Amino acid sequence: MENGYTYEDYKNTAEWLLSHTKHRPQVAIICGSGLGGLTDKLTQAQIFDYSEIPNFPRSTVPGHAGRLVFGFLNGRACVMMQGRFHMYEGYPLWKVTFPVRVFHLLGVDTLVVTNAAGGLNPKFEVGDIMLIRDHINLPGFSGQNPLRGPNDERFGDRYPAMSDAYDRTMRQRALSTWKQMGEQRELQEGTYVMVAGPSFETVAECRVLQKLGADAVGMSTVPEVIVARHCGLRVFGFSLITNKVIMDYESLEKANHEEVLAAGKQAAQKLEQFVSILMASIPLPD
Amino acid sequence: TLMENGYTYEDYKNTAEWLLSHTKHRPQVAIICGSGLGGLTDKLTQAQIFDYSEIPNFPRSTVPGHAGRLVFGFLNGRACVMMQGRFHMYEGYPLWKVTFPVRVFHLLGVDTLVVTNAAGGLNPKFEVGDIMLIRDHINLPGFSGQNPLRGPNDERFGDRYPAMSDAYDRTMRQRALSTWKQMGEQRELQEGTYVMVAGPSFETVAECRVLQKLGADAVGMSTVPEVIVARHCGLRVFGFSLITNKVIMDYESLEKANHEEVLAAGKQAAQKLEQFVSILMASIPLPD
Amino acid sequence: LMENGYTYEDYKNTAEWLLSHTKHRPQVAIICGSGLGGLTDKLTQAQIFDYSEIPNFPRSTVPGHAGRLVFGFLNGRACVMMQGRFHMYEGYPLWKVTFPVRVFHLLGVDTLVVTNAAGGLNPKFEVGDIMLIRDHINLPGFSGQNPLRGPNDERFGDRYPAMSDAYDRTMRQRALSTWKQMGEQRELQEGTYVMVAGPSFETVAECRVLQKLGADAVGMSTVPEVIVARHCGLRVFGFSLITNKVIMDYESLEKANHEEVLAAGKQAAQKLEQFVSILMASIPLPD
Numbered sequence: 001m002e003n004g005y006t007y008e009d010y011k012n013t014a015e016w017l018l019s020h021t022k023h024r025p026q027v028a029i030i031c032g033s034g035l036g037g038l039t040d041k042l043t044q045a046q047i048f049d050y051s052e053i054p055n056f057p058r059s060t061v062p063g064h065a066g067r068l069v070f071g072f073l074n075g076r077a078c079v080m081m082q083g084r085f086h087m088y089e090g091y092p093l094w095k096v097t098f099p100v101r102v103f104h105l106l107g108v109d110t111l112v113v114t115n116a117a118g119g120l121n122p123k124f125e126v127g128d129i130m131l132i133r134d135h136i137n138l139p140g141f142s143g144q145n146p147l148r149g150p151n152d153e154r155f156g157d158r159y160p161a162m163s164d165a166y167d168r169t170m171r172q173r174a175l176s177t178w179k180q181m182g183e184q185r186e187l188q189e190g191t192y193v194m195v196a197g198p199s200f201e202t203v204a205e206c207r208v209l210q211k212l213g214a215d216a217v218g219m220s221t222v223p224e225v226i227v228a229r230h231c232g233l234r235v236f237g238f239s240l241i242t243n244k245v246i247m248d249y250e251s252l253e254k255a256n257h258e259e260v261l262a263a264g265k266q267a268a269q270k271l272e273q274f275v276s277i278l279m280a281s282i283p284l285p286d
Numbered sequence: 287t288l289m290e291n292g293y294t295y296e297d298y299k300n301t302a303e304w305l306l307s308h309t310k311h312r313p314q315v316a317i318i319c320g321s322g323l324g325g326l327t328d329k330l331t332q333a334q335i336f337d338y339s340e341i342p343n344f345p346r347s348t349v350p351g352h353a354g355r356l357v358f359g360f361l362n363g364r365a366c367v368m369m370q371g372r373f374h375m376y377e378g379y380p381l382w383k384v385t386f387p388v389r390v391f392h393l394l395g396v397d398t399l400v401v402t403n404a405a406g407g408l409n410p411k412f413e414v415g416d417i418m419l420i421r422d423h424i425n426l427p428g429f430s431g432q433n434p435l436r437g438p439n440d441e442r443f444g445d446r447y448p449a450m451s452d453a454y455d456r457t458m459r460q461r462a463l464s465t466w467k468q469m470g471e472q473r474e475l476q477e478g479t480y481v482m483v484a485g486p487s488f489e490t491v492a493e494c495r496v497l498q499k500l501g502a503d504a505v506g507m508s509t510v511p512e513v514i515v516a517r518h519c520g521l522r523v524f525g526f527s528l529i530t531n532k533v534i535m536d537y538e539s540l541e542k543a544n545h546e547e548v549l550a551a552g553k554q555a556a557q558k559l560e561q562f563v564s565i566l567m568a569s570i571p572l573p574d
Numbered sequence: 575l576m577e578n579g580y581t582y583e584d585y586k587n588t589a590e591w592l593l594s595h596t597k598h599r600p601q602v603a604i605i606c607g608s609g610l611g612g613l614t615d616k617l618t619q620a621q622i623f624d625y626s627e628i629p630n631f632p633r634s635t636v637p638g639h640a641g642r643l644v645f646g647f648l649n650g651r652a653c654v655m656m657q658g659r660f661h662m663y664e665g666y667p668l669w670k671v672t673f674p675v676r677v678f679h680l681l682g683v684d685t686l687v688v689t690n691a692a693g694g695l696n697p698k699f700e701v702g703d704i705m706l707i708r709d710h711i712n713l714p715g716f717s718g719q720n721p722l723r724g725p726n727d728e729r730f731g732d733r734y735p736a737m738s739d740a741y742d743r744t745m746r747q748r749a750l751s752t753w754k755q756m757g758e759q760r761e762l763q764e765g766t767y768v769m770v771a772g773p774s775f776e777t778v779a780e781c782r783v784l785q786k787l788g789a790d791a792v793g794m795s796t797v798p799e800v801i802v803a804r805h806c807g808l809r810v811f812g813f814s815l816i817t818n819k820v821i822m823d824y825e826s827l828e829k830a831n832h833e834e835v836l837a838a839g840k841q842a843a844q845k846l847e848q849f850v851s852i853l854m855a856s857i858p859l860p861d
């Protein structure tokens with residue numbers, strides 16, 4: 001049917017946050033599974049648990065803390081979600097994407113979406129960072145789009161375009177800068193496909209997603225990106241390739257959450273250095 | 287707990303009987319007008335207008351580019367009823383509301399449903415302003431559960447497991463093609479597969495390429511549910527798309543799909559749509 | 575919050591009710607597909623429960639599906655058989671569709687055998703073929719329709735279960751090698767089952783999509799049960815009866831239809847019973 005939040009609910013939450021912190025973020029960063037350590041490098045950090053914040057969705061997941069952290073990252077005013085919400089948990093997409101519109105109302109102009117993802121492109125290795133050039137929204141094709149229902153004109157248009165969702169200039173700048181990281185592995189770029197989960201893919205399903213032209217797969221991110229673009233936010237995205245999706249019947253290996261968290265923790269230092277360089281490539285407001 | 291149709295058989299019947307007792311018109315053909323195609327009701331003679339708000343059990347709309355009215359009349363001498371303004375899944379309607387009027391038309395005594403829409407071109411040979419005959423569809427929402435027949439089957443309308451391989455009437459499409467060839471028009475009448483996606487946001491480049499790889503020639507957010515319900519209750523079905531824009535299929539382009547361009551393409555093709563709908567009426571069999 | 579309406583206690587109450595109303599203690603659960611209800615005929619010492627008798631069990635009406643649970647022995651192996659499954663197209667949410675699978679787990683079943691009728695997408699399949707399910711494509715699952723959606727119950731399984739090993743490798747190898755004993759002209763087929771919601775049959779363009787995706791057979795069931803089975807640690811074996819060849823060209827005047835599907839089931843019933851008999855012998859014992 002429809003979004004349960006009114007415009008006033010988003011506004012009340014934003015105003016509450018603005019009156020309880022001196023921080024005025026330009027960039028919002030959503031931290032994915034095992035990527036919560038990205039909040040460690042924030043200076044002058046102020047923490048809000050989701051339970052404190054009016055209208056915020058309330059449950060957990062292990063690997064995802066449940067807190068909003070305001071601070072400076074490489075001198076840039078940021079707000080960071082440590083713990084995102086997923087459709088597989090039972091949330092409708094208008095709950096999943098609620099914070100994105102809150103960030104818009106806080107005065108954020110840029111959303112950085114991060115996630116763990118399974119590698120579908122065979123040239124990707126575990127520990128690679130893949131810039132999200134584009135996505136395939138499989139749930140969206142069937143009806144599961146966060147904009148379903150009446151459009152709120154105060155956020156955006158009825159029929160927003162998504163062909164330019166992942167900012168071209170930021171990706172070019174992130175690629176050219178990656179020279180400064182001094183890494184053996186080059187920065188990957190490709191298409192993220194969203195599937196609902198929560199179960200991992202079969203071999204046949206992996207091959208479907210490969211045939212469709214997806215380079216990495218996950219269960220998040222796309223709804224947030226749609227809502228961000230709907231309200232005019234610049235969007236940058238990247239995936240940590242935490243595992244190679246099983247694509248043959250001979251293998252005895254199986255995708256599993258423990259391996260996903262481990263890959264996150266092993267890459268944590270490299271992710272923090274990359275997000276630092278990323279802040280320098282973000283245009284200022286106005 | 288059980289996901290089912292909220293309308294009873296009696297609700298459809300009450301709406302049909304209400305319409306039949308408030309107009310002298312007895313339509314054979316129902317025509318659903320797509321986005322920017324509402325001007326197709328202008329050529330109706332002896333027109334009688336009902337706003338959807340007047341009609342019992344009818345859904346109440348909310349889209350700009352879609353008026354919200356049922357128009358009875360004669361189109362090229364043929365008794366028609368026309369929907370100016372359809373309902374979409376992206377608006378929040380369940381598919382049993384979206385397709386409600388199709389069963390009403392069946393109960394009015396309509397034997398043919400003409401479905402029209404605006405669509406994005408996926409086939410690179412299509413140009414803006416082309417008319418594509420719908421030979422077939424790909425029902426992506428249907429694969430996942432979003433089918434208008436979900437829930438208990440009403441035997442009074444049709445079977446539990448209706449076939450869709452013959453949904454778009456073969457004879458009407460052949461007649462439309464042969465009649466077009468006789469006109470000696472330079473630009474050909476196109477024919478292809480329509481893929482339904484829910485929307486309401488437009489496709490990414492990667493998504494466009496998915497739909498191309500799947501063998502779709504045009505994409506939109508409607509039509510397929512109506513066609514399924516029509517075929518379920520035995521209606522003959524004819525479909526066509528106005529190609530209102532070419533879907534963005536590369537990352538170099540600065541162009542973006544947008545509603546304003548879609549409406550504009552509709553208005554620009556008005557003359558060509560009227561000539562096409564004229565030939566179309568001639569290709570529809572009379573009742574027994 | 576979109577969640578399972580059953581608590582752990584509901585599953586447990588249903589299992590305990592069944593355990594206290596039959597002396598049978600099944601090791602293997604078998605779900606009978608459309609026109610495959612005759613698989614319950616070879617059960618010895620049979621005890622029948624109608625679904626209406628059983629607490630918390632879903633209730634309602636499809637033709638070709640009886641609506642009963644049958645406990646008994648099949649080739650000397652303790653079985654429980656569903657004659658009549660539930661489908662998403664009927665209006666049931668997937669947590670109702672898959673409810674019996676968790677009940678079987680709590681009865682002490684360690685193996686689920688899933689059977690179905692399916693449309694042939696692979697052109698080498700003929701009507702009457704048995705296709706071993708090596709793998710599946712869960713199209714509804716991609717979009718959100720997964721029976722595990724909502725809070726995970728740790729007492730059944732993990733939050734993020736793997737499905738790449740869903741169809742037991744050893745049982746498929748044993749079923750293939752044994753099929754020699756059946757003495758059939760047609761070899762045992764093996765392939766990928768794609769689930770679509772239905773209830774309407776595929777268009778030609780849709781058939782070609784499913785072929786391009788690498789599916790060998792198509793149906794409207796089975797996959798949700800398999801996911802819930804694997805979530806709670808059950809060994810899973812699956813097969814499809816190819817009841818019709820899906821229409822893949824516009825020249826054909828033939829149309830898929832339920833009557834032809836039921837007829838194909840009844841014609842293959844004897845062969846299915848002999849195959850399920852050999853299948854029970856290839857299932858490992860408990861502990």
Ligand SMILES: Nc1nc2c(CN3C[C@H](CO)[C@@H](O)C3)c[nH]c2c(=O)[nH]1
Nearest residue numbers: 033116117118217218219255257260
């Ligand atoms: N679908 C999918 N998602 C993921 C993810 C991303 N998320 C990580 C977490 C499971 O560990 C879920 O929220 C999905 C990592 N690897 C994979 C994979 O192989 N497949």
Ligand SMILES: Nc1nc2c(CN3C[C@H](CO)[C@@H](O)C3)c[nH]c2c(=O)[nH]1
Nearest residue numbers: 159321404405406505506507545548
């Ligand atoms: N999905 C999709 N639909 C359309 C349509 C059809 N409708 C037109 C209207 C948005 O302008 C929606 O109801 C969809 C035209 N062009 C396109 C396109 O490029 N994509």
Ligand SMILES: Nc1nc2c(CN3C[C@H](CO)[C@@H](O)C3)c[nH]c2c(=O)[nH]1
Nearest residue numbers: 447608691692693792793794832835
């Ligand atoms: N989708 C699909 N399903 C089936 C089935 C399996 N079920 C059989 C029954 C309709 O006859 C539905 O429950 C689906 C047999 N043939 C086909 C087919 O061609 N297509």
